Amino acid sequence: PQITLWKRPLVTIKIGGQLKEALIDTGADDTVIEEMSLPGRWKPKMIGGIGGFIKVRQYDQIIIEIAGHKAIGTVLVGPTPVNIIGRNLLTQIGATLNF
Amino acid sequence: PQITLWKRPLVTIKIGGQLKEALIDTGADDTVIEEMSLPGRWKPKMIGGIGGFIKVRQYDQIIIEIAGHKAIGTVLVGPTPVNIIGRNLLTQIGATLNF
Numbered sequence: 793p794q795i796t797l798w799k800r801p802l803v804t805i806k807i808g809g810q811l812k813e814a815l816i817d818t819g820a821d822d823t824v825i826e827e828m829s830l831p832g833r834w835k836p837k838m839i840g841g842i843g844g845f846i847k848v849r850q851y852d853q854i855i856i857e858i859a860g861h862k863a864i865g866t867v868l869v870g871p872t873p874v875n876i877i878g879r880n881l882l883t884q885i886g887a888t889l890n891f
Numbered sequence: 892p893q894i895t896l897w898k899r900p901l902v903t904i905k906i907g908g909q910l911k912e913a914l915i916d917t918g919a920d921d922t923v924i925e926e927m928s929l930p931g932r933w934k935p936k937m938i939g940g941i942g943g944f945i946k947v948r949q950y951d952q953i954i955i956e957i958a959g960h961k962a963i964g965t966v967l968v969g970p971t972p973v974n975i976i977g978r979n980l981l982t983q984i985g986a987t988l989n990f
């Protein structure tokens with residue numbers, strides 16, 4: 793699709809069989825989701841945002857759908873204010889910015 | 892242009908007579924710039940994201956040129972770790988997300 797920016801670019805995602813809302817975020821390197829259970833082992837990661845740094849859990853090779861488009865990749869889980877879909881998965885679905 | 896998302900989408904902006912580099916952030920409601928002088932009255936604002944909140948100064952009716960495209964709107968100034976172009980200005984330059 794084409795998504796304009798007059799409103800927040802919120803989409804539905806599917807992860808772990810569950811539908812969630814998330815923000816398409818070109819300003820995010822990574823994909824960060826609120827607390828949930830994911831399978832397998834995780835590794836530690838520190839990430840930064842507008843207000844400082846937080847610790848998250850890094851899960852690799854997670855199956856995720858973004859607005860109906862299939863991706864398989866890294867998902868960070870931790871105390872983000874909002875679920876964000878970042879560039880690691882936006883590149884898998886072929887997303888670009890255009891003006 | 893078409894901007895891919897393999898790397899951070901950085902652009903040059905001109906604001907207040909100065910050139911700066913800034914991140915195109917579809918996940919940002921507002922435009923947030925590191926400390927600089929701007930004309931006119933301001934009022935304080937708290938803005939949040941990963942890591943919590945920072946205090947900024949809100950300036951209205953600021954003219955800005957983003958990768959060569961002129962727009963006018965509100966600009967927030969304060970201790971942001973990165974200069975951010977948010978949706979309030981991205982709409983004005985006609986920026987969309989496409990996949």
Ligand SMILES: CCCC[C@@H](CN[C@@H](CCCC)C(=O)N[C@@H](CCC(N)=O)C(=O)N[C@@H](CCCNC(N)=[NH2+])C(N)=O)NC(=O)[C@@H](NC(=O)[C@@H](NC(C)=O)[C@@H](C)O)[C@@H](C)CC
Nearest residue numbers: 819820821822839840841842873918919920921938939940
């Ligand atoms: C979580 C809230 C929504 C998404 C977030 C994305 N902003 C980018 C800004 C760029 C960094 C300061 C971000 O945090 N990106 C992170 C996301 C986490 C991630 N890992 O992907 C990032 O890429 N972090 C990199 C570090 C980038 C460093 N950059 C640099 N040195 N130049 C990282 N690997 O940790 N938006 C925001 O932080 C904005 N928040 C908002 O728009 C709204 N706030 C809330 C809470 O929704 C509004 C109600 O204020 C701020 C700027 C105010 C207008």
